[PDB]
Amino acid sequence: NSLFGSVETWPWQVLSTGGKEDVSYEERACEGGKFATVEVTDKPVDEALREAMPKIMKYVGGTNDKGVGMGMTVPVSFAVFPNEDGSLQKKLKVWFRIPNQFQGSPPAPSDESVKIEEREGITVYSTQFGGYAKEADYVAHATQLRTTLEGTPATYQGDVYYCAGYDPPMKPYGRRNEVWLVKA
């Protein structure tokens, strides 16, 4: 006797949404899927980002442990840790989202600098805004959400936030922006 069979799905469930006018927040649960992230310390967000940029590209580029030659297209997001001065100085963690096309069975990490790990059991707040959004905007919206979420049991640590974006546009014109806030 013998048999087999399984599935593969990581849907996200929302607990509730809302917030103040202009800017709204959304509480969702981490799907728990596997993603490729990198760790960069002793370097500024500018260095850690410029260093991780190519580090993550090497994976999807073809430098995989399994030697898979397919390719994936998706926006990458990294975490940041603001300080009392507003400057992001401490640590930087890059997160590369993988498309369902690869999620079905992504290749192993050819390098240690970037490994595929999954994160689940965390609750963050998503806030989307339109109009001209510059680099500083992302840092401002992060704190703006804090006061906007006022009157709620929602907690935070260091006001840490995440930045999601496809690629750096030749101009500051940021029509689309994304900022996630991990509740403490």
Give residue limits of the domains in the chain: 12-184
For residue 168, report the phi and psi dihedrals to the nearest 5 degrees: -70, 110
Sign of the C-alpha dihedral, residues 34, 45, 25, 171? Answer: negative
**In DSSP terms, which residues pair with 78 in a beta bridge?**
94, 163
Q: What are all long-range contacts of 97-104, with beta carbons under 8 Å and residues at least 24 apart? A: 97/35, 98/33, 98/34, 98/35, 98/36, 98/72, 98/74, 99/72, 99/73, 99/74, 101/70, 101/72, 102/70, 102/72, 103/8, 103/10, 103/33, 103/34, 104/8
Asked if 178 and 142 touch (Cβ cutoff 8 Å), the reply is no
| Alpha-carbon distances of 79 from 128, 141, 178, rounded to whole Å | 17, 14, 12
Distance CA 142, CA 146 (A): 7
Give Cα 2 distance to the centre of its chain: 42
Element spanning 57, H or E: helix 45-61
Structure tokens that stand for 61 in this block: 């580029």
For residue 160, count other CB atoms closer than 10 A to its CB.
Answer: 20
Structure tokens that stand for 184 in this block: 């403490």
Asked if 95 and 35 touch (Cβ cutoff 8 Å), the reply is yes
Sign of the C-alpha dihedral, residues 25, 30, 31, 36? Answer: positive
Structure tokens that stand for 49 in this block: 């980002």
Quickly tell me which residue has 């927040």 as its tokens: 25
Residue 78: which of 109, 57, 118, 49 has the closest Cα? Answer: 49
Distance CA 164, CA 79 (A): 9
Element spanning 46, H or E: helix 45-61
Q: In what order do the strands lie in the sheet with 14-18?
A: 14-18, 25-29, 123-127, 178-182, 161-165, 76-80, 91-96, 34-41, 114-118
DSSP per residue, 125-175: EEE---S---HHHHHHHHHHHHHHTTTS---BSTT-EEEEES---SSS--S
For residue 37, count other CB atoms closer than 10 A to its CB.
Answer: 19
For residue 61, count other CB atoms closer than 10 A to its CB.
Answer: 11
Structure tokens that stand for 163 in this block: 């930045």
Element spanning 102, H or E: helix 100-103
Superfamily of domain 12-184: Regulatory factor, effector binding domain (3.20.80.10)
Residues composing the chain: 184
User: What determination technique applies here?
Assistant: NMR
Asked if 180 and 162 touch (Cβ cutoff 8 Å), the reply is yes
